[PDB]
Structures are given as C-alpha cells and as structure tokens.
A paper describes a structure:
Here, we have purified and characterised recombinant [name] from [name], which belongs to the Ub C-terminal hydrolase ([name]) family. [name] from [name] (Gene ID [name].1) is a 233 residue (25 kDa) protein that is predicted to comprise a single catalytic domain belonging to the [name] family. With 100–1000-fold higher turnover rates, [name] cleaves the ubiquitin–ribosomal L40 fusion protein to give the mature products.
There are two molecules, A and B, in the asymmetric unit of the [name] crystals. [name] has a weight average molecular mass of 24.8 kDa. This compares with the mass of 25.5 kDa calculated from the sequence, and we conclude that the recombinant protein is a monomer. The β−sheet, with a strand order β1−β6−β2−β3−β4−β5, is surrounded by α-helices, with helices α5 and α9 prominent in their close packing onto opposing faces of the sheet. The active site cysteine (Cys94) is located at the N-terminus of the buried helix α5, with its side chain at the base of a groove. In both the A and the B molecules of the structure of [name], the side chain of His171 adopts two conformations. In one of these conformers, the imidazole makes a potential ion-pairing interaction with the carboxylate of Asp169, and the cysteine thiol distances are ~7 Å suggesting that this structure does not represent an active state. In [name], it links helix α8 to strand β3, and in the A and B molecules of the asymmetric unit, this 12-residue segment is disordered with four and seven residues respectively missing from the electron density maps. Binding of the Ub moiety in [name] would require relatively small changes in (i) the conformation of the α9-β6 and α8-β3 loops to accommodate the C-terminal tail of Ub and (ii) the β1-α2 loop so that hydrophobic interactions with the β1-β2 loop of Ub may be formed.
Author numbering: -2 to 126, 131 to 159, 168 to 218, 224 to 233
Amino acid sequence: GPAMWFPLESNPQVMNRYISTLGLTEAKVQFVDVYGVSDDLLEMVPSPVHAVLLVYPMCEATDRRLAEQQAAQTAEVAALRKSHPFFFTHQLVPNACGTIAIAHALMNNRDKLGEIAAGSILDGPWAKAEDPQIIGKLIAEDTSLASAHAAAAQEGATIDLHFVCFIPVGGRCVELDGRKENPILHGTCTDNRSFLTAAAAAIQERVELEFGITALVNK
C-alpha cells in the first residue's frame, strides 16, 4: 500500500538506471561497488568518492551505540547545520530507505550530477524544498517517486536491513540515516581519501557486531 514500499537492493546497475529515471538525463556520476573496508579494497574505489552508501542489518548493539552518539552530539550537529549546510530528510515510509539514501547522496552533490530534466522527480516539489520531518513527509507522499522506487526495487529482485549514506561535511564523516532524529557524526577527515577511511572505519565497527557498500563516483 502507500505507506509500505518494496525494499530496494544494493545493486549499482539498478541504482544507476534508477537515478536516470529520477531525472538525471546525462548522469556524470554513477554508483559502483565497494568490495570491503580493508585498505586493499578501499584502494580499488575510484577517486573522488562523493558519498558512501551502506545497507546493513541492525543489531541492538549498533542501535545502542547510535543512541549514545546522538546524545553526545546534539550541540555539534546543530552547529554543523549552520556552518556547513547539508540536506537531511527523515524516512517516514518503511523500506523507502534505499531511495532516501540515494536522495541523500544526490542532493548533497547537486554540483556533480549533470542536468536535471525539467519536470522530473528530481525537479519535483520535495527536491526544491529546512526541517527533516517536512521534507520527509513530501518524499513519503510523492507518488511518482514511490512508483519509480517500486520499478527499481523489482529490477533488483529475484533481519531489519537499513540503508544509509555517508558524506563529508565540515571536516567530519557524516551518516545520514532517515530512521534517526539527527545526522550522526563519525570520524574527522581533511581530504576525500580520509573521508573514505572514516566511512570505512564506521562501517567496519558494525561488521564486527552481509553488508552492501557502494560509492557515488564520477562517470
């Protein structure tokens, strides 16, 4: 029904066709696989990385750690929203999280994307449109988005999984999880490579507690 979507699988080919359907007419970015979090595997990732996407199963331990990070970080997260503004939305619909993650990656990298087709989902009211609840509502309600998501999900088709997005913001590796109140702050970083290291370190901490990792890179 309207308020439960089919799950989108972590699959770069499916994701790349999807972002085309969302309105990227000639995408200058693409998703690729990240094969793991060792230095060896990270070296294989193209550079620069604009965003790291992760699908993972929640464990109570991981959820615990996140609660403590949220509680430790309220002040610094508020400061960062002002100092280095970024796009964050809540996820109001179950299983919308692959789309939220892709939205997070794209909308925090508009300068990289290429042309957005006039009239496309990415040109839509939510995309133009502050508060994560309000944006979240509009995304949850966009029937064009829901329909495109369904089609992408089906293309990939043949334990509480969550899909999230890591971006660099003001010298910090930031996790955008639409199922959390606030962005989560992880390691510090100074350049793009150290951001990838910081995202990988956050991921590796949960691996020890399977995972699908992708990266948004230039095409």
